[PDB]
């Protein structure tokens, strides 16, 4: 309700250099993340209840600040 960055059911946490977005909508949703700079990862689809690792606020990274809902387009869908 309060934090609504993407499909809602997806929830990230910041564990140093690991922004774990755990979805729970029961459906696949594409989520993107906006970093303090941009370590290139602002679009990845989630599996129902799955995760999406994103370069957290590490010194070798940036810091994801906001999640965004992505449209059906994963980087390399083989």
Curated annotation (Swiss-Prot):
In which domain of life is the source organism classified? Bacteria
Cystine pairs annotated here are 9-25, 43-70
Keyword vocabulary terms for this entry = Alpha-amylase inhibitor, Disulfide bond
Which Pfam families does the UniProt record give?
Answer: A_amylase_inhib
Q: Does the keyword Disulfide bond apply?
A: yes
What's a single GO MF annotation on this record? alpha-amylase inhibitor activity
Q: Does the keyword Disulfide bond apply?
A: yes
Which SMART domains has this protein been placed in? A_amylase_inhib (SM00783)
* Entries under InterPro entries matching the protein: A-amylase_inhib (IPR000833), A-amylase_inhib_sf (IPR036379)
Q: What does the UniProt record say this protein does?
A: Inhibits mammalian alpha-amylases specifically but has no action on plant and microbial alpha-amylases.
Name of this chain's protein? Alpha-amylase inhibitor Z-2685
Q: Please name the source species.
A: Streptomyces rochei (Streptomyces parvullus)
| Upper classification of the organism | Bacteria, Bacillati, Actinomycetota, Actinomycetes, Kitasatosporales
